[PDB]
Amino acid sequence: CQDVVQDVPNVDVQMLELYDRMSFKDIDGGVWKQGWNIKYDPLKYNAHHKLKVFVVPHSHNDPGWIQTFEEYYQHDTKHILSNALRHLHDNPEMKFIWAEISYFARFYHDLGENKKLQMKSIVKNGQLEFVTGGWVMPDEANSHWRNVLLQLTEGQTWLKQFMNVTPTASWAIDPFGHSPTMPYILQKSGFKNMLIQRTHYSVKKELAQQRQLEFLWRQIWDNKGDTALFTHMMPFYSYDIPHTCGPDPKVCCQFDFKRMGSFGLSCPWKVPPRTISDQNVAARSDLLVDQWKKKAELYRTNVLLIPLGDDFRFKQNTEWDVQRVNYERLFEHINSQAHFNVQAQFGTLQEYFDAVHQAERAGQAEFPTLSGDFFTYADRSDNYWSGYYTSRPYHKRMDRVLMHYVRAAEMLSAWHSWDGMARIEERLEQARRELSLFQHHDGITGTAKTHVVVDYEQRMQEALKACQMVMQQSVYRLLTKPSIYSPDFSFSYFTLDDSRWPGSGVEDSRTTIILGEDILPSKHVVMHNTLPHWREQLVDFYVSSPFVSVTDLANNPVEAQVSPVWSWHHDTLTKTIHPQGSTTKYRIIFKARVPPMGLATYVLTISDSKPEHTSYASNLLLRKNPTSLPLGQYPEDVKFGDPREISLRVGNGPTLAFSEQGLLKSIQLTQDSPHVPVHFKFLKYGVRSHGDRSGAYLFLPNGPASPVELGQPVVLVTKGKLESSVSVGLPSVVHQTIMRGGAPEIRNLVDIGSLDNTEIVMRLETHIDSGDIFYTDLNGLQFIKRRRLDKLPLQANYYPIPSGMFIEDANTRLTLLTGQPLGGSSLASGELEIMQDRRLASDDERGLGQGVLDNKPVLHIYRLVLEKVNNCVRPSKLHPAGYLTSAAHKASQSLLDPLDKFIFAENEWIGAQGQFGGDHPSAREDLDVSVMRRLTKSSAKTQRVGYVLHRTNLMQCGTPEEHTQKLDVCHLLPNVARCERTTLTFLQNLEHLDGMVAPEVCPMETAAYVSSHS
């Protein structure tokens, strides 16, 4: 295995180093506004060395943005695809590329058989070519790598089945900045080439000057280069026709033949396109070839890519004709005039890349190597697209909940083959497709119109229900004696209980377990652990009595804690935010211990008085002017006091101190250690009163954030043996710090209310000597080093925080893990900050046509890990990556893939079993079974099950951490007949494995395996 820590890769372009050297000056470059006046030697091309030009027609189709997916399909996309089929069928030399399989599948299934056959023929013959082939063209900033792979697999599996093709070239022209997680996944999924567009204008200029717009993009830790994927970055401001023929949009716009008037479009540079005729074709070709030769100067081979398309183009039949006929007249003239030394034609993306590599192999060019990312994007001036790292945070959090429910539903149901009447495959396909759709660059990004966001939310809600149905049917089958199991596939044997989604204060959705001497003495609950190692985690349920005790199925008592159910209310009469306790529902909390990829059953039993193994938390309400807080049968009376500083410690864990406002002030790791200053603070950013306004995409603050005025907030302290917490009702945020014995969990119930033009940020202030360095993750896959640059504005120093961020010095590190993607930064040494929500009244001029005024309460979750790192083996100062410690990685897993909880619905579960998976291997902590998916329906004689295995890389800090078992996924199911390594989409077999054994993967590697069972 390659060492991902100690070997700094030698690359031609390392983006962090490039950023340190670049000046980012925004000067007027002439017609190419953000470049320079390109010059070329007319003698460069001649009869023995011609410029080969591929004009690639395309249509950017958004699966929801300003209209919903179905509205766009009915109004635009179905016509684009119907007319593409007709026009390509009738014009053999015309070509077209297509990216969004969600739309193509929706269209193809509705076609009659004659047209399905015509469509397959134009794909098989190379006229219509799929590019990337994912369900969508995903966002690359907020998306988790697992969901990027899910959507890629959904689209490519459909293409293989119905079109018999698997794209090896990717096209990503609209995500707002680009992540190296894409070439990582694509290169492990058979790809050979990829194309990107939205990168900072200063980066395009710098790379264009060095002819480094085509490069071999490798991961930041890859010393050898095995992850490298050839990448083409487009050079200009847009993918539209005015910014794709060459450097001068005033000229290129004249070659967009849809802009002459009858289509309702025009050229803003004021020179309209003119129909090509024999009297103007020579002057028109002279202008067009000059633009092409200038564009060609920015690249190394004699093969030039000229995209020809825009949003929802190639709809009308008249549009197909006007573009095709005019370009055909240009090609006929150009290709016949030897003096131009050009051969131009319509082509596809793969044709362009095949020609570029033919030139490379002939020795006509060598390409530079590159590592790093392309965040944060700016398309012009100081307009940095860091707002969408936070926009619509409720749905960003929903994305992560559904991510986990899809994984758990696919894994729980994979253990068995199911009859078609159970509708398992149907519900899982629905769930995968709705989550996949949301990965779109207007879905998770929070950049769609209000009614479109509602459509995505409704689709995800249906997906969550589908996952719950599959999970509970699976638990019932896995834990009931086989000869007793009698399923009704429409019945709810268990209901899921989720403590953090939608969350307390967001939706009262959890069911109370109702026990009583005159109704039901006890209830079975089951926990699932999707991770491949034994895991303990505290779990809580709502119960109708405080006198409840817990047992495992061997009837061994389990220690439990009961606490009240507290809900916070914004009291419009007293004008205070304070908690109310239930006098009939209580929370019972206990430690569940669950096998790797397994299940564990417990029983909750009521008694008339305090049970021996259940303790009760104390509760202290700190505020001036308190009023009573009765709690029914709860045995300890609530205590009151004036606001004051307090300290808490659960178990042998850290001791945390809080200010009188209920905010963390220090963390003491052990009895002997110092009280390290770690202070939480909430602040607000505003919007500029002159100039450009922040919107869904752009973050344009009116200066550094100002502190939120806190007043004298009400603080609630709950102290228990298993769990303690401090909660405070601040303006717009109920902030909670929860302690269970290790790093605290932070929960913020964020309700920005009607605070227009406000962004609320949560900041951590420490004295850690981080300087200008901080680390953020990319798609939940890797941590990349960031350097704050004071030569750039505040919003340029904001980066996506898809799952975590940290600062460190020689001795100390503070890591904040998140359960949802949000934007964040480190704006001064010792600080971390992450945005919670933003409410903007204005549109930001990118086409959305509205602000962001549809905020709703969201429960954000986090883990806060302070650690000593002086003993850890870390990368050298020049290495561009960082790595988590074991504790921080486990904390991230506790947020993203918690135990699932099931409550048996009926009164008695006949045939119940106590555990499933006790014999499953408990794998080393850095290894995960990211995906377990049965790939065959029950009618298949040979069953196939696919696994995606991912190994992260954790720092070595001196912990012996030992004894774990080798995990061979190919032997998890019995009767294995074959084990194969495959691409990550499971679509191509790469290796037949000896002994039917699936080897574990190396640090930072991901592999896929399929086991076959007789």
Ligand SMILES: *[C@@H]1O[C@H](CO)[C@@H](O)[C@H](O)[C@H]1NC(C)=O
């Ligand atoms: C799929 O494509 C391969 C490669 O050209 C071809 O051999 C095979 O016959 C095709 N499958 C179908 C649809 O028959």
Ligand SMILES: [Zn+2]
């Ligand atoms: Zn788009």
